[PDB]
Amino acid sequence: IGQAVNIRSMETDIVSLDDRLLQAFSGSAIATAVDKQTITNRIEDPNLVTDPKELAISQEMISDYNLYVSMVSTLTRKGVGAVETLLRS
Amino acid sequence: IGQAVNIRSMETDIVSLDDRLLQAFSGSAIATAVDKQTITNRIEDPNLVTDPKELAISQEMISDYNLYVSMVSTLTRKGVGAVETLLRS
Amino acid sequence: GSGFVAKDDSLRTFFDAMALQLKEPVIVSKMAARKKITGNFEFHDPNALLEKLSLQLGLIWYFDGQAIYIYDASEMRNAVVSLRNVSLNEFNNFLKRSGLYNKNYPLRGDNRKGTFYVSGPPVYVDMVVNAATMMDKQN
Amino acid sequence: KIPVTGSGFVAKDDSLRTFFDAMALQLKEPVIVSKMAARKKITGNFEFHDPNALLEKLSLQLGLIWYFDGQAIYIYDASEMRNAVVSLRNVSLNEFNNFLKRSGLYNKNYPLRGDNRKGTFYVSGPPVYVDMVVNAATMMDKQN
Amino acid sequence: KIPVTGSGFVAKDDSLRTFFDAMALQLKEPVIVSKMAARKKITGNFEFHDPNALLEKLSLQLGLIWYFDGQAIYIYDASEMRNAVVSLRNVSLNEFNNFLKRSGLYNKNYPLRGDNRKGTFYVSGPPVYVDMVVNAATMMDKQN
Amino acid sequence: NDISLIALLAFSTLLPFIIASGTCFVKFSIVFVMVRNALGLQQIPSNMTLNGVALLLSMFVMWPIMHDAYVYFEDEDVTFNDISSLSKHVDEGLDGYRDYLIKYSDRELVQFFENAKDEIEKPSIFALLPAYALSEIKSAFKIGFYLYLPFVVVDLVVSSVLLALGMMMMSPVTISTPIKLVLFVALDGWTLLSKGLILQYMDI
Amino acid sequence: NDISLIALLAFSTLLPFIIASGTCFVKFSIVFVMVRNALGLQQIPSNMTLNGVALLLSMFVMWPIMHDAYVYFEDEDVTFNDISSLSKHVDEGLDGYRDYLIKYSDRELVQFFENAQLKRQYGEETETVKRDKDEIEKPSIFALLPAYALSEIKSAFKIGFYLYLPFVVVDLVVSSVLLALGMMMMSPVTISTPIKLVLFVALDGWTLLSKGLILQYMDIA
Amino acid sequence: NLQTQVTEALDKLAAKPSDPALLAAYQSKLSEYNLYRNAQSNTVKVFKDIDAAIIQNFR
Predict the structure, then answer these.
(1) Which ranges of chain G would DSSP assign to H, the alpha helix?
(2) Cβ contacts (< 8 Å) between F85 and chain E: which residues?
(3) Which residues form the domain of H14?
(4) Phi, psi torsion values for D44, nearest 5 degrees
(5) B70: chain H residues, CB-CB within 8 Å
(6) Exposure on the CB side of residue A23, measured as CA atoms within 13 A
(7) Structural domain tally of chain H?
C-alpha cells in the first residue's frame, strides 16, 4: 500500500486567461489517462482478479471513473449551450 | 489464415480542397466496407465464433466499427450545422 | 576579459549567455521569463554569481547533472510520502550514490521511519516522489 | 549617483512582494508571499541587520502570519489561518512530537493543543503547516 | 563569379536550417532540426574546419541540445528537454548499460544516473534519446 | 483521449461563433452588403447568397491555418508523462492562429487587454480576439466609405441637371438607379474588388 | 451530499438567463445596438457577431468575480454539522456577487422594492424603511437584480444619447444645404451616409469606447 | 499467455480421467479462466458505453 500527496496548490494572479484553462485541461486529461491504465492492468493482472479482497476495490474504481467523466460531459454541454442561447438570439 | 500487409501510403498532390475531400472520402469508404465484410466473414465461418479467444477480438472490432462511423456522423452533422447558422445570420 | 552588457534583456537571453561560462545548458521557465535586467556583468565566478542573483531577484534553481533548471519563487511545491518497507537512510544513500543529493533542499523526517517531507523545485519533487514510490513496489 | 553610505532599503510605495524579496538575502532562504497578503503596501526607509526580529515585529504591526519550514519562508495574511481537529488511532501525541522535534518541523509559535498521551488534539496555523501536520499524522496511522 | 579567396560559409540572415544543411556535408551525416529550434536566426562568416568541435561551442552559445545516433544528428533547443524515471524488474543497471555500449548508443554527455545494482535509474536528455531509452529498457523485462 | 473527445466536440459546436467573430468573414460579409446599400437596392440579391460567396471567399485564405492543426495534432507524441509539457504542446499548436491574429490586430489595444517583447512570449488568445474583430469592423468601415464615394456623384449630377431645367418636383431615384449600376458593370467592379480583397491577405 | 449535485445541475441549467439579467452584458449589448442604429445601418454589422464581441468583454470583466466561487465551493469542508450554519455558508459564498450588485445598482430603485415586497408580504401596517439601512443591513438577492437591470438600462441609454448627438448635427446641416439649393425632392440620407461613416472612422470610436467601458468597472496599474 | 496453461492441463486429465488431484487442479484452472474472461468482457463494455454517451450528449 503506497500513497503520496502534494499539499500546497500553486496559486497566483495571472491576468492571462487561456493558460489557466490549459492547466485545467491537461490536469483532467492526465488524471483520466493514468486511471484507464490502472484499471486495465488491474484487470489483466490475473492475481488481482481472483482475490475477493482486491475485487471490492476493483468495483469501486470503475465507478469512480464512470461518475467523473460523465460529470464533465454534462457540465460542458450546459456550458456550451449557455453561450449558444445568447449568441443565436 | 496467412496474412500480408502493404507498407506504402502514396501521396498525390491535391489541386484544391475538392481534390482533398475526394481522397478523404474514398479512403474512409473502403475502411468501412472492409471492416463490415471482415466481421461478416468472421461470423459466417462458424469455427471462429465457437472459440473463447476470438470472441473478445470480434467484440473489439464491433466496438471500433460503431465508434468510428458514429464519430464521423456527429462531426459532419455539427459541420453542416455550423454552415446553416452562418448562412442564416 | 569576458562579460555581458545587458540592456533591457528578458532574463532568458541573460542566462543563455552564461551557458558558455557555465558548462551546462540552462532551462528557464515560462513564468520566470517576465522579469528584466540591465547592467554590466562580468563572468569570472559563475557559481558564486548565480546564487547571489538568485537570492536578490527571487528564483530557485537546480542542477541535476545535465542542465540547470531555473524557476521563480512562487512555483515551489511540497509533498509528504509514506514508505512501507524501506527507510530514509538507504534512500538517502540512493541519492548520494546517484548524484541527485541537493544539500539546499534536504529531506525532513525521522531517520529510519516511513514518513518524510519533501520541498523544492518542481523538477526535483516529481523525481523524488516517483523514485520513492517505485522502490516499495520493487521491494 | 547613489546616496548616503549606510545600509538600507528605500521603499517608495512597494506592494509587499517586491519588498520581501529585498529581505530575501539577509534571510538566506527565498520568501513566498500569498495573494491576499500581496495587496498591502509599504513606504519608508528600512534597515535589515537581523531580519528574524524585524519580520516578527512587522508581522504583528501589519497583520500577517509566517512559517519557515527549513527551505523557504511562507507568508500569509491573518484571514487565511485554518484549523482542524484530528484523532489518532494507533499512535500518541508524544510519539508524534518526537517526530516533529527530530525532523525540525516543530514550531513553538503554533504548538499542538491536546492531552499529552491520547489520540485527539487540535492544530491551528498557516495552511502549509496544517496541511502538513494533518497528512503526516494520518499517514502514520496507516503505517501502524 | 563567386569571389572570396577562402573556404567557408557566408550566412546573411539564415534560419538555422539552411545553416546546418551547409554543415551537413562536412559532417558525414544528415542533420534534423526541430520546429521550435528553427525560429532563431544567424548571420556572419563561418568556417567548418572541424564540425564536431564547432557544434559543441555553438550549441552552448545559442542554447541547444543535439544527439548523434549513428545515422543522423538531431538538434533541439534547450526548452524541449524531457526527463523521466523508470524502474526495471529483473535486469540490473550494469547489465542494461552494457547494451548501450555494445550497440553504440552510450552517450557520455547524458549518462544514466542511478545505483549500480537496482531497478530504478534516472534518465534525461533529448526526446529522441528518452523515447529510445524508456522503450529499450521496458522491452527487456517482458522478455525476461 | 476521452477528455480530448470533449474538446474536439467543443470546437465543432462553437464553430459558427468563432467563424462569426475571429476571421475575415466579417469584413467580406460587411462590404458585400454596403455595396447593395450603395447601389440603392434593398433585397437584391439576398442576405443568403451574399453570405455564401463571402463564406467560400473567407474559406480560401483560412483553410491552411485550419489544415496545419490537423497534421500537427495527428502525430504520435501526444502521450507525455508531464501535465505542463502537454500544456506546452497544446500551446505550441495554436501558434498558427496567434501569428494570424497579431498581424491584423493593434498592439496598443492588445496591450490594454493584456494589462487587465512579444518574441519571448506570445499574448494570450482571449486578450486579442475582440481586438481583432474590433479592428476588422473599423477597417471595413474605412474601406466602405471609399467605394461608397463615386455613386454620390452620379446621385448629385442628375439631380443638378434636373434642377437646371425647371422640373424640380421629380424624384431622381427612378433615373439615378439606371445610371448607378452601369457605373458598376462598365467598371466590372465585382470581379476586381474580390481580387484585391483576396490580395489584401494572401499574396500572389 | 447527493442532492448537492442536484443543486449544482439545477444551477447549471438556469445559467444563461442569469447572464441575460444579472451581469453587465446588458450594458454592452444595448450600446452596441445603439451605435448600429445611430449610423443608420440596419442589418450590418450582423448582430450575431455583435453579441459575441459584447459577450467577450463582459466575461473579461466578470471572470475574477466568478472564479472565487469555484475555489470557495470546491472546498472539501462544504458539509457542516448544523442546519443553520450550512445555510449560513451559502450566504457568505454569495456575498461576493451580492456586494457587486450593491456597488453598481441605484440607491432608491433598490429601496423601492423592499417597501413594495413587504406590504405584499404582511400588509399595509408594515412601516417603511429609509436610506439609513445602508450602513448595516443587506437586501435580498431577488429584490436587487430588477432594480439593477433597470439602472443599467438607464446608464446604457445615458451613454447612447451622447454619441447619438454628433451624427444628428451632421444630419441637419445636410438637410439644410440641400434646401439651400432647390433640391427639395431629394433623399438626404444617401448623401449623409458617407460623412456619417467618416466621423466615426476618423474619430475611431470603437477603440476608445471599448477602453471606456472597461474603465467604468476596472482600473489600469 | 493464460490460454497456454489452460490448453496444457486438459490433456493429462483426458488421458487419465480418474486421478483425484488432477481434476481438482483442472477445476481450479477452469473456474479462474471463467473469472478472467467475463472480467475482460465486462471491462470493455463500460469503455464502449461511456464513449457512446458523449456523442449521445452532444448530438
Answers:
(1) 3-13, 15-21, 25-38, 48-73, 83-93, 95-104, 107-121, 145-162, 165-180, 189-201, 206-215
(2) 82
(3) 1-59
(4) 160, -175
(5) 52, 55
(6) 8
(7) 1
